[PDB]
Amino acid sequence: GAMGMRNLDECEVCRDGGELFCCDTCSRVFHEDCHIPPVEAERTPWNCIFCRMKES
Ligand SMILES: [Zn+2]
Ligand SMILES: [Zn+2]
C-alpha cells in the first residue's frame, strides 16, 4: 500500500535546531511529542522523556 503515515520530518523544532530527548525507537514513533515541551527539558545530562515517564 503506502507503508503508513510515518514521516515525522515536519518537526519545526529539529529545523530550528531544537534538542531531542528520545531514544531512536521512541523518536521513530513519537518524534513530534518528543520535542514537547521544548523548554527546560532534561539537559542534565540527557533523558528520554517518554522512557522517563514510563508507558513505553
Ligand atoms: Zn524533531
Ligand atoms: Zn525512550
Curated annotation (Swiss-Prot):
High levels in spleen and peripheral blood leukocytes, much lower levels in tonsils, thymus, prostate, ovary, small intestine, and colon. Very low levels in heart, brain, placenta, lung, liver, skeletal muscle, kidney, and pancreas. Not detected in brain, liver and muscle. Interacts with PIN1. Component of the nuclear body, also known as nuclear domain 10, PML oncogenic domain, and KR body. May be involved in the pathogenesis of acute promyelocytic leukemia and viral infection. May play a role in chromatin-mediated regulation of gene expression although it does not bind to histone H3 tails. The chain holds residues 687 to 738 of 867 of the full protein. This antigen is recognized by autoantibodies from patients with primary biliary cirrhosis. Induction: By gamma-interferon. This is Nuclear body protein SP140. A zinc finger (PHD-type) spans 8-54. The modification Phosphothreonine is found at T44. Phosphorylation at Thr-44 promotes binding of PIN1 and subsequent isomerization of Pro-45. It is found in: Nucleus; Nucleus, PML body; Cytoplasm. It comes from the Eukaryota.
